Amino acid sequence: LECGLDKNDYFLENMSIVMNSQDAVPFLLDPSSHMITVISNYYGNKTVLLSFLEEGFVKRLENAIRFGSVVIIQDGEFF
């Protein structure tokens, strides 16, 4: 909540589902990209944002995986 998660019980349950289990990658859908910043406030410096549409994506992820960087990928529709 301190990051800026919404008060709604629905949005609490959702955030819980994202975090609590990560034996698998979570897919976040939100029209208002309010959520992209919530996860950013949580991981701080470590937060590196990418998008399937940028050209350097292919290499930037290889750099992200090698040095423990927490990654959010901005365009999930295109994969």
Binding site: N45, N63, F67, S69
Partner: protein, 313 residues
């Protein structure tokens, strides 16, 4: 050890070839250059390794169908050379086998799992190769590939109709620098880069300076080549613009010496070490822009005098 001359020398030849690997390591292990030297070692290595691959064909152990100490040697060797090169054994599946075979022997396997087994390091901690106490890593493996890449920097050089030589195919090196720069920034995210980090910060200062001079140099190269079409060739155009052509030619001299001095260095990176490069080109591009700006004022003032010229272009 063997029964007599022949069988004893056979078992010693196994001893020997094992040492020709253990020793081969130590000869390039103290070296400061190790990340570059292994290349020429691994090229020779084949010739030596081959002999062992053959010996291992149709035989259970070197020196025969009865197991010798050489089998426990090859096992250790194979385990060790794979760390030095990940692909060195893949071309000898016969050894990859012998290795697993040995590890299968109940006494041996019980040992590898025992307390007496030293899992690492490979050499004395002090050694450059296989040293250190810091059980794991890719910070060094990558930085070796970065430095290797920048001591192979090549600029296609192609001289045009007049004096000066042109640098073709900018983007490739241009891209690589930006990528390699992004790589070092993401290296700060890593936990294990802290002390090894200081040197990378020096390589960061070296490449951030290389992009500083990369940005300005393509501008100069571009703006000069364009202006060369316009004033470099005609007498009539330089007749109309005397102050403009006298200032173009003065920069043409400087840049001719700047290129030929920079190419003969034979390392694009080494260019950052050259005196007054960022300052030279920043000042050259400023003056090149003043000529192009003055031509632009000439054409528009020509057009305003006879407003048909507005149609022409």
């Amino acid at each position: 050890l063997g029964g007599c001359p022949k069988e004893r020398a056979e078992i010693s030849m196994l001893e020997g070839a094992v040492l020709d690997i253990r020793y081969g390591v130590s000869r390039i292990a103290y070296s400061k250059d190790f990340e570059t030297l292994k290349v020429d070692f691994l090229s020779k290595l084949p010739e030596m390794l081959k002999m062992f691959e053959d010996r291992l064909c149709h035989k259970t152990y070197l020196n025969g169908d009865h197991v010798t100490h050489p089998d426990f040697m090859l096992y250790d060797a194979l385990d060790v050379v794979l760390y030095m090169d990940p692909m060195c054994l893949d071309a000898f599946p016969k050894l990859v086998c012998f290795k697993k075979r040995i590890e299968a022997i109940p006494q041996i396997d019980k040992y590898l799992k025992s307390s007496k087994y030293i899992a690492w390091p490979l050499q004395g901690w002090q050694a450059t190769f296989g040293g250190g106490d810091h059980p794991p890593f890719v910070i060094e493996k990558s930085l070796n590939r970065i430095k290797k890449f920048w001591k192979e920097a090549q600029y296609e050089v192609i001289e045009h109709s007049s004096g000066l030589k042109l640098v073709r195919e900018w983007d490739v090196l241009e891209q690589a620098c930006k990528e390699d720069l992004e790589e070092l920034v993401s290296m700060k995210a890593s936990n294990y880069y802290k002390i090894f980090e200081q040197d990378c910060l020096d390589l960061e200062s070296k490449l951030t300076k290389l992009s500083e001079i990369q940005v300005n140099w393509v501008e100069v190269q571009f703006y000069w080549l364009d202006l060369y079409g316009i004033l470099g060739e005609n007498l009539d155009i330089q007749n109309f613009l005397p102050l403009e052509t006298s200032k173009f030619k003065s920069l043409t001299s400087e840049y001719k010496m700047i290129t030929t001095r920079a190419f003969q260095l034979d390392t694009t990176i080494e260019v950052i070490h050259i005196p007054n490069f960022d300052t030279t080109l920043k000042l050259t591009i400023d003056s090149l822009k003043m000529i192009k700006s003055s031509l632009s004022t000439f054409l528009e003032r020509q057009r305003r005098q006879f407003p048909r010229f507005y149609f022409l272009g």
